[PDB]
Design an enzyme around this catalytic site. Structure first.
Site, PDB file in Angstrom:
ATOM      1  N   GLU A   5      48.735  49.399 -34.863  1.00 51.86           N
ATOM      2  CA  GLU A   5      47.774  50.381 -34.380  1.00 51.86           C
ATOM      3  C   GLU A   5      47.160  49.960 -33.054  1.00 51.86           C
ATOM      4  O   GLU A   5      47.068  50.756 -32.123  1.00 51.86           O
ATOM      5  CB  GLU A   5      46.666  50.586 -35.415  1.00 51.86           C
ATOM      6  CG  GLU A   5      46.525  52.018 -35.898  1.00 51.86           C
ATOM      7  CD  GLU A   5      47.817  52.807 -35.784  1.00 51.86           C
ATOM      8  OE1 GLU A   5      48.677  52.677 -36.681  1.00 51.86           O
ATOM      9  OE2 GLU A   5      47.973  53.557 -34.798  1.00 51.86           O
ATOM     10  N   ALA A   6      46.733  48.705 -32.971  1.00 46.27           N
ATOM     11  CA  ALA A   6      46.133  48.198 -31.743  1.00 46.27           C
ATOM     12  C   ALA A   6      47.217  47.988 -30.693  1.00 46.27           C
ATOM     13  O   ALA A   6      46.922  47.744 -29.523  1.00 46.27           O
ATOM     14  CB  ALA A   6      45.405  46.888 -32.017  1.00 46.27           C
TER      15      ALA A   6
END
Ligand SMILES: *[C@@H]1O[C@H](CO)[C@@H](O[C@@H]2O[C@H](CO)[C@@H](O[C@@H]3O[C@H](CO)[C@@H](O)[C@H](O)[C@@H]3O)[C@H](O)[C@H]2NC(C)=O)[C@H](O)[C@H]1NC(C)=O
Ligand SMILES: OC[C@H]1O[C@@H](O[C@H]2[C@H](O)[C@@H](O)[C@H](O)O[C@@H]2CO)[C@H](O)[C@@H](O)[C@H]1O
Lengths: 252, 263
Positions: A163-164
């Site tokens: 996600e990051a």
């Protein structure tokens, strides 16, 4: 196959040590010249061999106990993970990953796909309350190491890495987390962009390269839960800090 | 393979200076009616539709250029009769609407209300900065650069360096205007200005005027690059103590990376 891999030891780990880690993780899954406005577009099943079908992530917990989770180079998805002669695969698990990932360990499949909704339903909770951060990460890797790896701890990882990896917003959100050594919970925005990866994906490939306006709009969400519709690319970037685009359509 | 899909028409607004919207005078669907800056608002003259053919128009009257030559103004006229070339427009991510055939770009000499627009020699200026969007409201954000530090705005005409991030200090609250300019949220009167186009050139918080220096393009790589001069803003010698952000040839290093975090 000895698929490549990156490492990240929470111990003696600084904000920069994390940023660089994600960067390396991006330089792998993000190859090929199919990109728009500079942002790369993850390959597809056809344009990808099994030899480079998966990537391995190495996360060392405070107590040195490190767990590894392999991501799918075609979507930065958390395919699976291993721990001391043990391997786990979601309810799905294809023969592709089941016969090429962590070969040698016990291949016992879990009971839930990697779908966000699936994990949350298995953890009995939702992302909006599964605080992530330095300590939360430690408990994640640890839990997956001893307890065998539950849903909750799994969700903690996904948002923390893949996600990051696509959203620099979550990146700085975590970079600041370890910086102040404090945890935090996903807001309406982070979660919003977290569910609009595929949407904003084609919405950027539709406009084409070097184009600002979107053929449609992205349904984002502000802190107050209010709707945040982004119609231009410049806006999407200045907010979601995206850096990874998923395939949906090809140039015209 | 998997070809994409031809996009249908959509109505989005246009802004590019002092938060002013582009529209037609008195919303008269009559031909010849020129285009001009004017405070945004729910109205057709302010509403604009984009087509695949590369034509923008309101009230159903193609938004075409009046006369072709660096200095000519813009207006609306029937699509059919509209000059095949003087009707197409290009909107790159650089926040600019350049007219293909000619090469000129929608320029706004002065960011004053009721100011007519006109195609001119593209030189990369705030005046020549436009962002098509239904959300004419800019977004608040802090520029977190080197060592997780946020960019801070000191006094007028003063510099701008990296200070300990503080989501409360207004000096760190940066407002990104659609005109591709970065002005202080507290006071959107001054814009992030440079002191030249040569390496090591110092950056500051000069006033807003549309200068080629007040133009900032946010490269997808994470670096805020200056359009005129390919240079990019960064931390001099990485030493934040030096208290100074300057323009310097791209290097792809972290000391040149900047993040824009929501409110
Ligand atoms: C960035 O600075 C601008 C001003 O340069 C801020 O704009 C406006 O700020 C006010 C005050 O927060 C917002 O509400 C106001 O409340 C008062 C008191 O009830 C009322 O008298 C005003 O009519 C207004 O409603 C206002 O909504 C806001 N923006 C707009 C378009 O009105 C802005 O808030 C600053 N941004 C941040 C993140 O601080
Ligand atoms: O050119 C500036 C400004 O003109 C307005 O035109 C009219 C408006 O249509 C009418 O409703 C009002 O009573 O008087 C205005 C006189 O300028 C446009 O409405 C506006 O969009 C701008 O285009």
């Amino acid at each position: 196959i000895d698929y490549p891999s990156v490492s990240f030891n929470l111990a003696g780990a600084k904000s920069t040590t994390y940023r660089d880690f994600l960067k390396n993780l991006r330089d792998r899954v993000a190859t090929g010249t199919y990109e728009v406005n500079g942002l790369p577009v993850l390959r597809r099943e056809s344009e990808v061999q099994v030899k480079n079908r998966f990537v391995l992530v190495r996360l060392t917990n405070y107590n040195g106990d490190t767990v590894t989770s392999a991501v799918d180079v075609t979507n930065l998805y958390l395919v699976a993970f291993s721990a001391n002669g043990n391997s786990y695969f979601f309810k799905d698990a294809t023969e592709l990953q089941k016969s090429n990932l962590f070969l040698g360990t016990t291949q016992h499949t879990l009971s839930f796909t990697g779908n966000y909704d699936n994990l949350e339903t298995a953890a009995g909770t939702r992302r909006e309350s599964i605080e992530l951060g330095p300590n939360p990460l430690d408990g994640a890797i640890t839990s997956l190491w001893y307890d065998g790896g539950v849903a909750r701890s799994l969700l903690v990882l996904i948002q923390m890495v893949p996600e990051a990896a696509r959203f620099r917003y979550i990146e700085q959100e975590v970079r600041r987390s370890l910086q102040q050594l404090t945890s935090f919970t996903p807001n309406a925005l982070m979660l919003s962009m977290e569910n609009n990866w595929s949407s904003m994906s084609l919405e950027v490939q539709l406009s084409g390269d070097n184009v600002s306006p979107f053929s449609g709009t992205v349904q984002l969400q502000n802190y107050d839960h209010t709707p945040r519709l982004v119609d231009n690319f410049e806006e999407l970037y200045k907010i979601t800090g995206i850096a990874i685009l998923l395939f949906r359509c090809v140039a015209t | 393979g998997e070809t994409c899909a031809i996009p249908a028409p959509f109505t989005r607004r246009i802004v590019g200076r002092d938060g002013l919207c582009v529209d037609v005078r008195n919303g008269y669907d009559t031909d010849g009616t020129p285009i001009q800056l004017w405070p945004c608002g729910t109205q057709r003259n302010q509403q604009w539709t984009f087509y695949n053919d590369k034509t923008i128009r309101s009230m159903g009257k193609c938004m075409t250029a009046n006369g072709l030559n660096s200095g000519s103004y813009i207006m609306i006229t029937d699509c059919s009769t509209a000059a095949e070339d003087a009707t197409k427009w290009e909107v790159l991510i650089d926040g600019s609407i350049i007219n293909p055939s000619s090469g000129l770009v929608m320029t706004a000499p002065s960011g004053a209300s009721r100011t007519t627009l006109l195609l001119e020699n593209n030189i990369h200026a705030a005046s020549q900065g436009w962002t098509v969007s239904n959300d004419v409201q800019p977004i608040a954000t802090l520029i977190v650069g080197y060592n997780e530090m946020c960019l801070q705005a000191n006094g007028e005409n003063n510099n701008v360096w990296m200070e300990d991030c503080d989501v409360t200090s207004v000096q760190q609250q940066w407002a990104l205007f659609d005109d591709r300019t970065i002005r202080v949220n507290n006071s959107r009167g001054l814009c992030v200005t440079s002191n030249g186009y040569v390496s090591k050139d110092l950056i500051v918080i000069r006033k807003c005027q549309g200068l080629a220096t007040q133009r900032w393009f946010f490269n997808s790589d994470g670096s805020v690059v200056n359009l005129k001069s390919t240079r990019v803003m960064d931390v001099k010698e990485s030493d934040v103590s030096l208290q100074e952000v300057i323009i310097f040839p791209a290097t792809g290093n972290p000391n040149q990376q900047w993040r824009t975090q929501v409110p």
